[PDB]
Each structure stands twice: as structure tokens, then as C-alpha cells.
Amino acid sequence: QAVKKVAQEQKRLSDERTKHEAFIKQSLSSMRTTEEYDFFISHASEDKEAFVQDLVAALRDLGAKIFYDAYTLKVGDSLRRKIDQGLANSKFGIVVLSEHFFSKQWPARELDGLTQTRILPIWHKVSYDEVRRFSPSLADKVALNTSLKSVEEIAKELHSLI
Amino acid sequence: EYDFFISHASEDKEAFVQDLVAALRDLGAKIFYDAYTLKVGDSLRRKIDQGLANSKFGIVVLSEHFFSKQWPARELDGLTAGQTRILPIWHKVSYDEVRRFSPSLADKVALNTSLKSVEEIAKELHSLI
């Protein structure tokens, strides 16, 4: 009888997951509907070899043009000026939201300013409470998750913007 | 008997487990966790079997520290199965890196701390009484 409630929870979790995938796909459709390069990707020094390499390896196979060596954050400058120089070069921009990213200690106003738009944040190995601590607004809104989709699926989803 | 039991790595007990146990105790549920913290040399399947006997439901928290303990593949793929009384919780872990250990566990949907808050996960767990 105890398993039945686990089944009910299972069904609820499944419906919620369905709604979430629908939401992000609907926002990307509105984003595409609304530059020499396709994407640029802002990340920390620690995430570069770990996740970013795999993502650009995934996107370049689909035929996307990216450059990630340029946009490594040293945590010594403004986030705004780093995302605007990339919007001048690329069609879209990606920010990898991780523990290494939040450890740089960025001004609240800039994180509040990260949120049609051409910028797409990707949650990588973070909890909701943790993101809510640095900026509750950034955590409240929707973004891509590495906990929900594989790197390859994420790459296809991004490629739908071009 | 107890309501839940929550197995976990020794590293996540102060970061997430203490918070969840606190939240679930604030909701009137009785759970125990210090007895079900696992060492690198353990049998996952037998440990959960001890857990389903002194409590009604079981919780496994899937984190980098949990996977750093190299469990057998058969014991992660067995978390899934058959009637199921166990509830996995994803905490700060990537999809692809779960696949490295168990694809069957990665395709199964579970509670995700990147989606809900600890208080929200607590309520959502309390719905099972």
C-alpha cells in the first residue's frame, strides 16, 4: 500500500517534468522567432575542461560556430561588459551557472541584470536554495538544466535557435 | 516504526541532509540518518533492506560524493527495482555524469534539488506520510 503513494508521487514528478520541458521549449521558440558567430559561452576557469569542452564538442558537430577560449571569467571584471561584447560577435550567449561561477562573488545588480532576450543561462550542478542565495530573481526564472537533459540533447535544443 | 530513512555519503550530511532532516522533523515526521550514513565499503542493497524494515519509506541522495563511492552497477540499477518503495533525490549532479554510473537510474525521474527547495521537497515527501 506504501508503494501506491510512491507511484502517485512518481506520476506527479513526471507531470511536472513534462511541464518544465514544455516551458523551456516554448521560450526558445519565442526566442528564435524574435552576427558572424552563433554562440559565445561565459564560464569559470574550473568549468572549462569539465563541461564546456563537452558542450562545444557537441555543438560543433551539429555545425555550430563557437569560441570559448575567449570568454573565460577571471572574476576580476564586470559581467555586463563581458556579455555585451559577446552579443556584438554572436547571435546568442550562454552562461554556465555553477558553484565555480558563483564563487567569483559578483555584484548583486549584475546577476539581477542577467535576465525577447538573447542570453541563455545553463544550470550546472547547483541547488535551488544555492542559486536563490546569490540572486533570488535569477533562481526564480527558468533556464536550461544539466540535471534534466544530456549534453547532446541540450546541444540540439540550442541548435533550434539558429 | 519510523516514517523515512535517508542514506547518504558522509560528505553531504552537513550540507544537505541536516537541512532536510531538520525540515522533515519540523513537519512532524520521525526519521533517522546517523545510522544510515554509508562508508566506501558497504552493500547498498542490504543497507536499504535494513532501512525498509525500521521505516516505511527510503531516501537515497544522489550526489558527486555518493557516486565517488564506486558502487557496483548492479546495485545502482537495482535501486530502480518490481514494486518500488525507495525515493532517490538528485542533488547537484549532472545527467551525463549519472549515466556514467547508471543509465537506468539517469532516465528514471526523481526529486531534483535544482527544481524545488528543501522545504518544498520536505512537503512533497510529507505527502506520502
Binding residues of B: 9-10, 39
AA letter at B2: Y
Residue A69 vs residues A41, A93, A110, B52, B78: alpha-carbon distances, Å: 9, 14, 22, 50, 42
Q: Please give the Cα distance from A7 to A93 (Å, whole number).
A: 40
Question: Among all residues of chain A, which has the CA nearest to that of B58?
Answer: A6
Q: Where is chain B discontinuous (C–N over 2.5 Å), named by the preceding residue?
A: 81
Give A143 to chain B, closest Cα distance, Å: 11
Q: Please give the Cα distance from B60 to B89 (Å, whole number).
A: 6
Q: Which is nearest to A128 in space by CA: B84, B30, B112, B28?
A: B112
Q: A125–B92: do the CB atoms touch at under 8 Å?
A: yes
CB atoms within 10 A of CB B47: 17
Give B39 to chain A, closest Cα distance, Å: 23
Q: Please give the Cα distance from B17 to B9 (Å, whole number).
A: 9
Give B19 to chain A, closest Cα distance, Å: 11
Q: A150–B113: do the CB atoms touch at under 8 Å?
A: no
Determined by X-ray
Interface test with A, best of B4, B109, B119, B123 (most A CBs within 10 A): B109
Sheet of B111-112, strands arranged across: B31-32, B2-7, B55-62, B86-90, B111-112
Q: How many domains does chain A have?
A: 1
CATH number of the domain that residue A64 is part of: 3.40.50.10140
Q: Please give the Cα distance from B51 to B40 (Å, whole number).
A: 18
Q: B127–A54: do the CB atoms touch at under 8 Å?
A: no
Catalytic residue among A35, A110, A152, A157: A110
| A36 has a chain B CB within 8 A of its CB | no
Range of the domain at B49: 1-129
Q: Are strands A72-73 and B55-62 parallel, antiparallel or unpaired?
A: unpaired
> Resolution of the deposited coordinates, in angstroms?
3.2
- Residues 69 to 98 of A: which have CB under 8 A from any B CB? none
User: Among partner residues B85, B96, B113, which is closest to A127 by beta-carbon distance?
Assistant: B113
- For residues A47 and A98, the answer to whether their CB atoms sit within 8 Å is yes
Using the structure block, give the residue that is written with the C-alpha cell 551539429.
A62
Q: Please give the Cα distance from A40 to A69 (Å, whole number).
A: 10
Residue A9 falls in the annotated catalytic set: no
Chains A, B: CB contacts within 8 A come to 73
Exposed / middle / buried, residue A146 (Cβ in 10 Å: 0-12, 13-18, 19+): buried
CB atoms within 10 A of CB B94: 25
| A157 has a chain B CB within 8 A of its CB | no
- For residues A98 and A45, the answer to whether their CB atoms sit within 8 Å is no
